[PDB]
Amino acid sequence: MKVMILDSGDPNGPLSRAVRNQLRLNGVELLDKETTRKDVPSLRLGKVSIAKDTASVFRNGQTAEYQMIMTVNATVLIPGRDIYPISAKVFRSFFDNPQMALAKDNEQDMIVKEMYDRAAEQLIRKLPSIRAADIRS
């Protein structure tokens, strides 16, 4: 069985929740707290940034779609090896006015949520096993 430590500043934060969930889905066990930390790798969640901008506009110059970009920086600490930085970047667009959208879309609430899932998915995918040492970038 795989294990690791999650260092979350806010365990209630959407990113943490997202990563935790992701980890469980990929069968990585979280350890409660710190002991044998010289044994298990830990994932530490760093900077997250979310940007929003007009992705497209109508003939009238007004905004049609928005583009959101979510950036997540983390580090993996494998005992005995160096801090291993990783990151995820998620792009997402949506129509400001749903009536202008051909397809049904979720709330902007869920849209941001979904980005957290995708970012966490990404971060999980980049996690080395016990068996490696990788170089940046």
Side-chain angles (χ1 to χ4, degrees):
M1 80 184 301
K2 275 84 128 66
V3 297
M4 72 168 326
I5 295 160
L6 183 61
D7 184 327
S8 272
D10 45 1
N12 304 339
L15 180 43
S16 304
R17 320 144 83 235
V19 171
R20 238 189 298 282
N21 180 44
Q22 211 60 49
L23 280 178
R24 255 187 263 96
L25 264 55
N26 291 271
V28 188
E29 302 297 352
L30 298 298
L31 300 185
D32 180 282
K33 198 174 309 176
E34 191 292 292
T35 190
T36 194
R37 221 186 203 267
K38 173 106 277 188
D39 199 323
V40 349
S42 67
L43 176 60
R44 180 186 179 111
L45 300 183
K47 181 155 87 160
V48 339
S49 60
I50 311 185
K52 189 187 190 189
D53 207 8
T54 294
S56 66
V57 310
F58 294 119
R59 185 96 182 184
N60 33 283
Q62 169 187 285
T63 294
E65 305 160 82
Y66 279 111
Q67 184 206 47
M68 292 202 190
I69 297 172
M70 165 183 290
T71 288
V72 183
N73 297 103
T75 51
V76 197
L77 347 185
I78 309 189
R81 298 191 169 89
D82 303 33
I83 37 249
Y84 181 55
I86 64 197
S87 59
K89 190 167 194 188
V90 176
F91 306 72
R92 166 84 188 223
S93 76
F94 53 82
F95 284 75
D96 201 339
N97 190 322
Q99 279 197 310
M100 298 310 189
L102 190 274
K104 135 276 181 192
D105 209 342
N106 311 311
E107 314 304 295
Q108 196 167 149
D109 297 305
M110 297 313 94
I111 278 180
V112 160
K113 196 257 175 183
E114 168 191 323
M115 297 183 86
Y116 275 117
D117 300 331
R118 294 297 183 69
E121 192 173 39
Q122 241 169 96
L123 284 172
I124 267 38
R125 253 73 187 82
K126 298 227 69 200
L127 293 175
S129 202
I130 34 189
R131 300 183 165 86
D134 311 332
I135 153 181
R136 78 90 77 198
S137 61

